Subunit: 474 residues, 2 copies
């Protein structure tokens, strides 16, 4: 006897600006850290970059009408800070704001709720040049200026706002693994940049309470809930260490304004804990969000990792199955394959019960409503003659996840909406274009833009039916 | 690399009044529910009861001397409400108080820190007769007045207090399994009494803040940390339900003053949730403790339990190994033996790492300092020629748990103290005397009451040494 999806439930889809828009140098846009980074040889699969992407900047009207045909209730998109401030903190580029105003008016004329993400990884390069972007306190008031600019221009028409999208990923990939700008591999630097970003998050939520008093705002955390391998007590302890270090490290700051203490102590023992200024704890504790945004693709299984043990591991970016290997922190935990679920070709675990677990943990720990800001399956799609894309595998993966969402609602979790990643196919940051996530196929590949034509996948019509029935038919 | 135990670490040992005191009808002592219950034939192994026990009411001076010789920094005991108010709510019994006053002066004069437990399961039978005891709100101001009397008489000499001891055990065993007074098997009544015990806990903490401003107080919870059997997602989900239902159900009320929602909603849907009055939440939320008390003996591993599957199961109090059977809640979870630890012959888990996990879960979820109020191993001891009890099995169990406490302190958990269970052998509630927990053997069995002479076991000398080396030598 399941609860129904509430009447307001935001059935959505999502994108990110640098992955979709193109027009990387048009209408006064400044360079972002991604415009520069993806151009350095070797950084991205086959040198793929966002100069054009799938040209959503020019094609937004076509894309929006396709959202209207699907009947989408909400659209989640990111604003590119370099179009608004080409030098990050100078004078506003009105042409930049005018694209987003055009896009927002298009959505509202079709009855679609905009969900605006303030930051999806594309800090302007000028700020990196000036003071090292996220590594400097100067970015707090710079992000603030930007965010208020958007709050004052669009706050009357946008109620739902996301602050930092997957801060855990952009910080860790940019400063620990070196895979994303600025390409640094330095844990001390990572944790310092992380602290600054936590302060910037708080500062903008606070500003939001003044400028958009009737809006709702949250960060969007990349959440992979941890499991222990088994009931061996050392494996369970690994699970405690992992959930704390990977998930609580961020979500507790978001919900409570405090870092967990075991993880803090372990960092301190290693000289890695961030520098804290007078007033930091106060700011962080006073920035309560309306919801926890959750981007969910998979759970992670862990086991005991001796101090002489596994550290960085191999990340599958090819799409050859079986190629990833264990990653962890020596002495705390390492990952291991969950033998009780299937994986993708990119070795991502398929675990829709995991999403129920994840949503249950957040309610249980923080008592927060959740907006699911991303969930999706990336796979090769074949375009068959007659402009046909049979993506049964995507429908299956989305069906099972939406089913478990309802179970969670039934359990008592306040879930505000569900945004599938992605609306159209788009550019993956490191893996090019062939790992497709859209409801709408874009005719291009890694070698050619072809005509970038939009072709509705079978999953398009499945989700249209889900939305028309408010989830009752899956 | 281990931190040492702090310099003021309360190395302790513990008892419960009914289990140790006797003098069941002396100096004005009223009847307790256990005096009555235990006399009913069937209830207790071979009719054993607390009329005499180990006669600590008469031999306390010999008992505090053996403490001083061991060098305990603290002793945890419970006050019998029926020595103080024979009627529960009538006139004060100055002689009942005088006994506790003599115990505390004895302890102080050997520089031992008294830890006073207000309630260990022995409400005056007169309150059960007048109004159902814990099933009535009337027990709130009666328990309060009792507590306030103790705080007024002893607060200047006792800094550490426990409020309700193992509340989950006296409620469950007393109102669901029917093994303790009042002998009931009714979940609705269980949860009502549970809720009233919660308000009583809170009310006495709020009194304590006024009467003992420089003191420290908290409840003590009987904690078996739940583990998932494996990384099967349905088993992890089972663990989420089990830890919330079995553990958070109590600890979140103690720390935060709120029940968890998924558990509450499950009860609400069975008709089982308690009755709430105006002011309940405000009082519960305003009763922050200084610490969380923890009674730990073992972890519990769980797995998926179908809606039709296992319910209440078979306990093994007989001591023959292998006879316990799975206990659970259909739909949520059921227990299963953990194949990665050994058990006792009572099918209890031997899992010292389990304690560190537990301590880590409390600091992580609540940020509270922990007082370990009970841990110990029960076994048969043989008295051998020359007054020698070679309790190696017990030393070994206790050593591993103290080793793991050190690791937790090193992880950054604030552990205030550790009270082994128990100082002298004592009366078990239901199983008699033969499963011994003491450092000090007491000469009596289930049949022959002999002379009750105190004989130091091998473990007494072990623990004297632990305390002498502040934990350095284990």
């Amino acid at each position: 006897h399941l609860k129904p999806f509430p009447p307001e439930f935001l059935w959505g889809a999502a994108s990110a600006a640098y992955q979709v828009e193109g027009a990387w140098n048009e209408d006064g846009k400044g360079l972002s850290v991604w415009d520069v980074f993806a151009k350095q040889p070797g950084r991205t699969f086959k040198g793929t970059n966002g100069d054009v992407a799938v040209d959503h900047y020019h094609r937004y009207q076509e894309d929006v009408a396709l959202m209207a045909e699907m009947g989408l209730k909400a659209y989640r998109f990111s604003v590119s800070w370099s179009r608004v401030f080409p030098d990050g903190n100078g004078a506003v580029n009105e042409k930049g704001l005018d694209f987003y105003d055009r896009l927002i008016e298009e959505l509202r004329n079709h009855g679609i709720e905009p969900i605006v993400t303030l930051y999806h990884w594309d800090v302007p390069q000028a700020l990196m040049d000036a003071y090292g972007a996220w590594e400097s306190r100067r970015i707090i008031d710079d992000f603030d200026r930007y965010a208020v600019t958007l709050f004052q221009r669009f706050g009357d028409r946008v109620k739902y706002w996301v602050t930092l999208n997957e801060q855990n990923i952009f910080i860790s990939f940019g400063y620990r693994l070196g895979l994303h700008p600025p390409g640094v591999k330095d844990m001390k630097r990572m944790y310092e940049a992380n602290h600054i970003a936590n302060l910037a998050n708080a500062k903008v939520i606070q500003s939001f309470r003044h400028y958009v008093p009737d809006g709702k705002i949250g960060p969007s955390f990349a959440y992979s809930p941890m499991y222990p391998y088994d009931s061996r007590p050392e494996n369970v302890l690994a699970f405690e260490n992992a959930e704390e270090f990977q998930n609580h490290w961020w979500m507790d700051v978001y919900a409570w304004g405090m870092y967990p203490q075991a993880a803090w102590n372990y960092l301190e023992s290693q000289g890695l804990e961030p520098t804290v200024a007078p007033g930091d704890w106060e700011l962080l504790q006073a920035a309560k969000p309306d919801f926890m945004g959750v981007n969910y693709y998979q759970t992670t299984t862990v086991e005991h990792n001796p101090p002489d043990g596994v550290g960085e591991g191999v990340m599958n970016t090819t799409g050859k199955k079986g190629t990833s290997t264990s990653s962890g922190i020596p002495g705390l935990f390492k990952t291991v394959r969950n033998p009780h679920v299937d994986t993708t070709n990119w070795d991502w675990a398929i675990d829709p019960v995991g999403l129920r677990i994840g949503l249950r943990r957040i309610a249980n720990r923080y008592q927060l409503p959740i907006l699911i800001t991303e969930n999706g399956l990336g796979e090769f799609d074949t375009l068959e003659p007659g402009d046909i894309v049979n993506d049964d595998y995507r429908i299956d993966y989305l069906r099972r996840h939406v089913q478990e969402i309802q179970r969670a609602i039934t359990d008592g979790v306040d879930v505000l909406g569900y945004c599938a990643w992605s609306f159209t196919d788009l550019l993956s940051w490191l893996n090019g274009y062939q790992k497709r996530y859209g409801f709408v196929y874009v005719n291009r590949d890694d070698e050619s833009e072809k005509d970038l034509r939009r072709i509705k996948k079978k999953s398009f019509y499945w989700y249209q039916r889900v939305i028309e029935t408010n989830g009752a038919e899956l």
